[PDB]
PDB file of C-alpha atoms in Angstrom:
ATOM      1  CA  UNK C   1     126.667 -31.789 -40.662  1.00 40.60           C
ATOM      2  CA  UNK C   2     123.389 -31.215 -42.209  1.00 35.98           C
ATOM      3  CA  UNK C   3     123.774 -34.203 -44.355  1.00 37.78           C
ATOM      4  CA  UNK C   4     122.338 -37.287 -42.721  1.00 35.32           C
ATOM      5  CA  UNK C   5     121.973 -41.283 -43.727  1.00 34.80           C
ATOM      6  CA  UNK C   6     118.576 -41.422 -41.947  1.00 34.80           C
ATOM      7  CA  UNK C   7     116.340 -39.093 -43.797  1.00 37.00           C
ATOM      8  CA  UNK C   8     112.415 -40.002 -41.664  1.00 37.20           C
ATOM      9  CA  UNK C   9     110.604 -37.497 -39.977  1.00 38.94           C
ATOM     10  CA  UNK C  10     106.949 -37.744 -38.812  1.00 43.11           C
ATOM     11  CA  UNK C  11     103.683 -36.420 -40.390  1.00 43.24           C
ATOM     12  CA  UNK C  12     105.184 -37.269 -44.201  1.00 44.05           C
ATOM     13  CA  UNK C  13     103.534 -38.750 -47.283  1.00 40.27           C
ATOM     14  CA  UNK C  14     105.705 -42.038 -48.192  1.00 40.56           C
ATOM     15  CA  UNK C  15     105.078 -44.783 -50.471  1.00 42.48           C
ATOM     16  CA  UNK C  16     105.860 -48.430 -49.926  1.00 43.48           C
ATOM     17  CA  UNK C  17     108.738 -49.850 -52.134  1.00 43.88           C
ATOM     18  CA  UNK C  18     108.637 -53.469 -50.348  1.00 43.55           C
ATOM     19  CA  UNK C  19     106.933 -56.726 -50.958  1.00 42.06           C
ATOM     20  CA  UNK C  20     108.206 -58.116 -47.859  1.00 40.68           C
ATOM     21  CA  UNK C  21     105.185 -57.400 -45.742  1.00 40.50           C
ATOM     22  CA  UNK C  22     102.950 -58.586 -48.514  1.00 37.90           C
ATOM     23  CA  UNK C  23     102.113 -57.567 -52.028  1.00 36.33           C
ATOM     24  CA  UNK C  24      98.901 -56.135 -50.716  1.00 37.96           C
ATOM     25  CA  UNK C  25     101.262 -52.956 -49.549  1.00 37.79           C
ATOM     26  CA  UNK C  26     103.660 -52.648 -52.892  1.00 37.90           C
ATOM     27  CA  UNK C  27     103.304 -48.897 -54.068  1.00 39.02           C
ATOM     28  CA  UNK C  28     100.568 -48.014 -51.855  1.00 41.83           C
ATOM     29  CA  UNK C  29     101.028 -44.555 -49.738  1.00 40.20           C
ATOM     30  CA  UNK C  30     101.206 -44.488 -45.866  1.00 40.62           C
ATOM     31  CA  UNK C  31     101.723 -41.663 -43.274  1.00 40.31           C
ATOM     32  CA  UNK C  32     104.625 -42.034 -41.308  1.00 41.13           C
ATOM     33  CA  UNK C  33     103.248 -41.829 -37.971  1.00 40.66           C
ATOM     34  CA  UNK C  34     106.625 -41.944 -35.489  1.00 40.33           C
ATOM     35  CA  UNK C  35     110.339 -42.552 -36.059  1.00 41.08           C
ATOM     36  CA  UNK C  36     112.108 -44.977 -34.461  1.00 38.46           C
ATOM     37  CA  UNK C  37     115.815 -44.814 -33.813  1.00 34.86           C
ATOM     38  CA  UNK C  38     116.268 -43.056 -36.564  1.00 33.09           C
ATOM     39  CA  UNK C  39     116.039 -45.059 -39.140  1.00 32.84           C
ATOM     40  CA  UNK C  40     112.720 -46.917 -38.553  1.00 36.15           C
ATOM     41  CA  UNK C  41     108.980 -45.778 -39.209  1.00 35.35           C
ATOM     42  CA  UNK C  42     105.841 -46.668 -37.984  1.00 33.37           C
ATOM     43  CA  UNK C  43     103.773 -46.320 -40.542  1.00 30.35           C
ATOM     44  CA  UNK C  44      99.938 -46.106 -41.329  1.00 31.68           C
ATOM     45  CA  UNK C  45      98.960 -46.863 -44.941  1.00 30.59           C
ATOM     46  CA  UNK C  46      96.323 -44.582 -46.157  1.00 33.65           C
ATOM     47  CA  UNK C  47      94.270 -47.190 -48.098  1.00 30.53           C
ATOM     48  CA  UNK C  48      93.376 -50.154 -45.810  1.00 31.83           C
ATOM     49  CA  UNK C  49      94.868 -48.187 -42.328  1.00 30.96           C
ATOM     50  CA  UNK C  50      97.139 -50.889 -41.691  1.00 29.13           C
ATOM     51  CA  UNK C  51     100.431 -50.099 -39.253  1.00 30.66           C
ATOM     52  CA  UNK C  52     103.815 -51.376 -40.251  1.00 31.66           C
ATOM     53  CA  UNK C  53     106.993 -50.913 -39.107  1.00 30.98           C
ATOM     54  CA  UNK C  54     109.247 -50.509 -41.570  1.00 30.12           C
ATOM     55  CA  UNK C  55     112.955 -49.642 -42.348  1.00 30.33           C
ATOM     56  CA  UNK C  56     114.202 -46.107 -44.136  1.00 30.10           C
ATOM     57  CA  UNK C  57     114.852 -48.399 -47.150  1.00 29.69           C
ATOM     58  CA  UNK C  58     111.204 -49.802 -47.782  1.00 28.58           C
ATOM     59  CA  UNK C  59     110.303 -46.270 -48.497  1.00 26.10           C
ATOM     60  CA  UNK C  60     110.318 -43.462 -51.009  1.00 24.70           C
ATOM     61  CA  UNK C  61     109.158 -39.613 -50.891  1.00 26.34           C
ATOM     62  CA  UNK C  62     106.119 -38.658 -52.346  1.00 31.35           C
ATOM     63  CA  UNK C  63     106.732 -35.536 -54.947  1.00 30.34           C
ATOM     64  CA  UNK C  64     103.547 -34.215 -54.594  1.00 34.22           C
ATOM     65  CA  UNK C  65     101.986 -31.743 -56.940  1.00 34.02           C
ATOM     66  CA  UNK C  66     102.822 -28.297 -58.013  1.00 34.81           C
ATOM     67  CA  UNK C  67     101.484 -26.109 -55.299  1.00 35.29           C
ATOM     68  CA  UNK C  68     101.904 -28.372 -52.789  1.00 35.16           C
ATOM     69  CA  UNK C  69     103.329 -28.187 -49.017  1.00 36.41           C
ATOM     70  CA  UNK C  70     106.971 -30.284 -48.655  1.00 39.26           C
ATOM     71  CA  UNK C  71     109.007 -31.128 -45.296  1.00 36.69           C
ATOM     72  CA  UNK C  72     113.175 -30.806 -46.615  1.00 39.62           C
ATOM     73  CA  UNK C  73     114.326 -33.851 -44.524  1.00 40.18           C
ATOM     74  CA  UNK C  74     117.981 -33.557 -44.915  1.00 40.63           C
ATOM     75  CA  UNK C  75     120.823 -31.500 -46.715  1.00 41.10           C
ATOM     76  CA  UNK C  76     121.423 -27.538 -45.451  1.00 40.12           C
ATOM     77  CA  UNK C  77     117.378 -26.228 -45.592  1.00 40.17           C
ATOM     78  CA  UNK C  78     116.627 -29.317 -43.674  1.00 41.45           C
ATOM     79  CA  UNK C  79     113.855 -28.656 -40.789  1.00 42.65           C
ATOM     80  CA  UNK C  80     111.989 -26.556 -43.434  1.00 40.90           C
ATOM     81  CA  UNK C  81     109.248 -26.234 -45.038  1.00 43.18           C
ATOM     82  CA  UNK C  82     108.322 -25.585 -48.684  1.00 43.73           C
ATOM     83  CA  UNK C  83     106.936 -25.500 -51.691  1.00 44.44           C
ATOM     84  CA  UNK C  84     106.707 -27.846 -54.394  1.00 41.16           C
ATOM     85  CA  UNK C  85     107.634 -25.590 -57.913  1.00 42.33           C
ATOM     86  CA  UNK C  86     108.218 -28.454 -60.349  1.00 43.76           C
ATOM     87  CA  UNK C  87     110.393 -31.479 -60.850  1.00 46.37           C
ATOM     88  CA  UNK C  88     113.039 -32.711 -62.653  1.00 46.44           C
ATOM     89  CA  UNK C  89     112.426 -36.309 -63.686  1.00 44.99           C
ATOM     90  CA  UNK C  90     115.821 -37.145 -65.618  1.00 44.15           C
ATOM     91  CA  UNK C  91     118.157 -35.676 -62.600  1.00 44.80           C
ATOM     92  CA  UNK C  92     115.312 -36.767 -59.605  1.00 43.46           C
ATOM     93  CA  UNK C  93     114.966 -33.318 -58.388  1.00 44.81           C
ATOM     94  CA  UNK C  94     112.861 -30.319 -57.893  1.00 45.02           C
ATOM     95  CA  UNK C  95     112.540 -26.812 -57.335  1.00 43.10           C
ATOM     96  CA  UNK C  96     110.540 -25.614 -54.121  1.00 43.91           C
ATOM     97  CA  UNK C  97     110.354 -22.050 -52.491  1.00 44.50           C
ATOM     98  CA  UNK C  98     111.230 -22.290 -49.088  1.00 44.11           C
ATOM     99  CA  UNK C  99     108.179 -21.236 -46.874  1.00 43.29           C
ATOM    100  CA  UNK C 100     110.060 -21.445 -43.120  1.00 43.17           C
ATOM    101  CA  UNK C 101     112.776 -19.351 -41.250  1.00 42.63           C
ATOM    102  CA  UNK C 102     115.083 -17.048 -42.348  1.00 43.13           C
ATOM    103  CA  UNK C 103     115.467 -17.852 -45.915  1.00 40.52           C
ATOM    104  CA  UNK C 104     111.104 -18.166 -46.521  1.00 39.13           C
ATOM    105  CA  UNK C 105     110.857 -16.999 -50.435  1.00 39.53           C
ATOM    106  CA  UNK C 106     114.091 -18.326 -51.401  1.00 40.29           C
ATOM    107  CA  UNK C 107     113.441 -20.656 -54.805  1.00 40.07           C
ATOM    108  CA  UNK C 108     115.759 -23.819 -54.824  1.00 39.32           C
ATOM    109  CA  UNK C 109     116.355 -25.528 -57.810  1.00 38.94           C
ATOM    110  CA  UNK C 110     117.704 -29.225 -57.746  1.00 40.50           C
ATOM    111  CA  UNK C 111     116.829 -30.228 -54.319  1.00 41.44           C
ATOM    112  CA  UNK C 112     117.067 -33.894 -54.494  1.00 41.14           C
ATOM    113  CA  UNK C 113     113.651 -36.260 -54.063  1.00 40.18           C
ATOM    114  CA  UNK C 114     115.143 -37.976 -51.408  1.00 38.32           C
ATOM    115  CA  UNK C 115     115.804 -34.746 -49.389  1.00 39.91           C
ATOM    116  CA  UNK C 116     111.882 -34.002 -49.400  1.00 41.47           C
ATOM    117  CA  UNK C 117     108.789 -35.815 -49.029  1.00 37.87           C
ATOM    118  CA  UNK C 118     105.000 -34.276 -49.267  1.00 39.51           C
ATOM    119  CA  UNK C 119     103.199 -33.372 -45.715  1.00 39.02           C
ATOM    120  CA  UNK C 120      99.881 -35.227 -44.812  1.00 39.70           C
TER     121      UNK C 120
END
């Protein structure tokens, strides 16, 4: 279906949530350069340029800023771009207008953070 466990793509915005590769990386933003096997990325931090390889759960989305361009990485507009409206902090999801495909203009309300990340 269009629901997926793995949720990486390529040419995101995602932010370290791990200490295990060293505190240096904790919270810092990195591109994710190539996905591996689904649910591994490769992974070039945006700070020092260092490459990692790291699993799907040593990294968040980035909820970039109102105005901003968004990749939907999973759920039914998945393969789409969008977007960013605003969020909603207290349910962890957003509104974007579609900007892809057959449904470009539609506003979605409520897409969850984890179904979108920001584009580099």
């Amino acid at each position: 279906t269009a629901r997926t466990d793995y949720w990486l793509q390529p040419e995101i915005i995602v932010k370290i949530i791990t200490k295990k590769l060293g505190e240096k990386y904790h919270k810092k933003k990195a591109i994710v350069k190539e996905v591996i096997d689904k649910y591994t990325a490769v992974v070039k931090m945006i700070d020092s340029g260092d490459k990692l390889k790291l699993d799907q759960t040593h990294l968040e989305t980035v909820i970039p800023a109102p105005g901003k361009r968004i990749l939907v990485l999973n759920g039914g507009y998945r393969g789409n771009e969008g977007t960013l409206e605003s969020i909603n902090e207290k349910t962890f999801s957003a509104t974007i207008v579609i900007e892809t495909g057959p449904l470009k203009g539609r506003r979605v309300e409520g897409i969850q953070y984890e179904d979108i990340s920001k584009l580099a």
